[PDB]
Amino acid sequence: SIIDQNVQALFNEISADAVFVTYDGQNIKKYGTHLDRAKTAYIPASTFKIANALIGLENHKATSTEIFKWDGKPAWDKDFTLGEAMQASTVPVYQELARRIGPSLMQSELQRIGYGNMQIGTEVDQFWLKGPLTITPIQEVKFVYDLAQGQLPFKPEVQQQVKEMLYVERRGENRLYAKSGWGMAVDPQVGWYVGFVEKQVVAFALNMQMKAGDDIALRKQLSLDVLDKLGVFHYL
Ligand SMILES: *C(=O)[C@H]([C@@H](C)O)[C@@]1(C)CC(S[C@@H]2CN[C@H](C(=O)N(C)C)C2)=C(C(=O)O)N1
Structure with a gap:
């Protein structure tokens, strides 16, 4: 198992506490510098957009065609569909969607599907940003x-x-889907890169500690390097 060694070697460069989890539908596997992160709950941050979009479309609060118009209050200063907002990671668009859903529906939907600790508190448009909603990398x-x-x-x-x-790119007929996240409001700050590769499916979640001034592109670069070493998503 030199593949595992090759993966672990990647993390020898990374100074931050990081775990990378993979799931192929049967096997959970864990790599990185602090494996206990995989079973620890953190705020989903921008990864919550996935569940937010789901709940919203499910409950007729938006469509994928609908344009969320900018209200002129100051980057994200333009009109977005939910899909456009996903890849741009436009928080206010998804905050608006959260407010359309409302705390009662949001709460019952998170309970219904068993997302994380299923806690939203009192602010319906901040709970994934500041807590109290948390989720383990394994859950993601x-x-x-x-x-x-x-x-x-x-x-x-x-x-x-x-x-x-969530579509990011394809190599041959292998497809990468992914969503990044950087929770800055919490201490310590958490970084996410969650997604999957469609050949059979291999889901993955990078979860690591973040600090102000860190390289924003590190999460994706690291994940792609790991996926390549695993042979899940080879470089072209
Ligand atoms: C969600 O994960 C996060 C929300 C909470 O903003 C988000 C969208 C921000 C970033 S990083 C982005 C790059 N430059 C900006 C900045 O420096 N600030 C503080 C305005 C923020 C990410 C990300 O995944 O990189 N997600």
Whole structure:
């Protein structure tokens, strides 16, 4: 198992506490510098957009065609669909969607699907940013695995729509879907890179500590390097 050694070697460069989890539908595997992160709960931050889009489309609070118009209050200073907002990571668009859903519906939907600790507190548009909603990397990886397979408790066409919002690139006929996250409001700060590769499916979740001034592109660069070494997503 020199593949594992090659992966671990990648993390010898990274000074931050990091775990990388993979899920192929049967096996959970863990790599990185602090493996206990995989079973620790952190705020989902921008990764919550996935569940937010799902709940919203499911409950007729938006469509994938609808334009969320900018209200003129100051980057993200333009009109976005939910898909455009996903890849741009436009928080205010998804805050608006959260406010359309409302605390009662949000709470019951998170409970219904068993997302993380299923806690929203009192602010319906901040709970994934400041807490108290938390989720383990293992939970995230299983979540996005089911999304890829269309086996979440949502309408099939809803899952397909949200799934394709996460599309990043393809190599041959292998497809990468991914969503990054950087929770700055919490201490310590958490970084996410969650997604999956469609050949069979391999879901993955990078989860690591972040500090002000860190390289924003590190999460993706690291994950792609890991996926290549695993042979899950080879470089072209
Ligand atoms: C969600 O993960 C996060 C939300 C909480 O803003 C988000 C969208 C911010 C970033 S980093 C982005 C790059 N430059 C900006 C900045 O320096 N600030 C503080 C305005 C923020 C990410 C990310 O995943 O990189 N996600």
